[PDB]
A and B are shown apart, each in its own frame.
Chain A
Amino acid sequence: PKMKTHRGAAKRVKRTASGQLKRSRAFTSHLFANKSTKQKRQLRKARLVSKSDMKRVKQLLAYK
């Protein structure tokens, strides 16, 4: 039948123009007293899913 989508993932990544996936960052919910001011604005950004993980999850997000 029609293949489904990892709904848990569709809420975490936006698809970018060259087919990349823009992801949000980790280590950013609490315990900020234990992380530096440098770590915090360099975590206030967006990175791309690394190609190794892309090879792992290509189909979980095929319809995005």
Chain B
Amino acid sequence: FEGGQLPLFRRLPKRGFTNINRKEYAIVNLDQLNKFEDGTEVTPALLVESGVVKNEKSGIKILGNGSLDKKLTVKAHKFSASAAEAIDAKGGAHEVI
């Protein structure tokens, strides 16, 4: 309240809506995948067991920040470009499910 002066949040206009169905994923970074080992065939369940992801929210998304220092195959729901080249450079596939 502002002593009868028009309050801030009516001076300003509303905008936007909510897309009731969003696909937002529990994200796992590149450097968070160097807690696995070489060649080892990671999966969403395996990384849930490892606890790197506290819950699979609507899938798993691999993003690219750090480095592998490794050579291994993966299987997740969605990938970014950087993730793709970063996996393929060291060798190892990424089977999208």
A residues adjacent to B (C-beta < 8 A) = 6, 8-9, 11-13, 23-26, 28-29, 49, 53, 56-57, 60
Is B12 interfacial (CB-CB < 8 Å)? Answer: yes
Q: How far is the CB of A47 from chain B (nearest CB, A)?
A: 10
Contact of B13 among A29, A49, A56, A60 (CB under 8 A): A29
Separation of A9 and B16 alpha carbons in the complex (Å):
13
Q: How far is the CB of B9 from chain A (nearest CB, A)?
A: 4
Cβ contact within 8 Å between B9 and A26: no
Contacts of A24 in B (CB 8 A): 12-15
- Report the count of interface residues on B (CB-CB < 8 A): 10
Contacts of B11 in A (CB 8 A): 26
Cβ contact within 8 Å between B13 and A28: yes
Contacts of A28 in B (CB 8 A): 13
Q: How far is the CB of A55 from chain B (nearest CB, A)?
A: 12
Contact of B14 among A12, A25, A26, A56 (CB under 8 A): A12
Q: How far is the CB of A13 from chain B (nearest CB, A)?
A: 8
Return the chain B residue nearest A46 by Cβ.
Answer: B15
1/0 per residue, CB under 8 A from A, across B8-23: the answer is 1111111110000000
Contacts of A8 in B (CB 8 A): 9-10
Cβ contact within 8 Å between A6 and B9: yes
Sample of 7 A–B contacts (CB below 8 Å): A6-B9, A23-B12, A24-B15, A26-B13, A49-B8, A57-B8, A60-B9
Separation of A23 and B16 alpha carbons in the complex (Å):
12
Task: Give chain B interface residues in 30-69, CB to chain A under 8 Å.
Answer: none
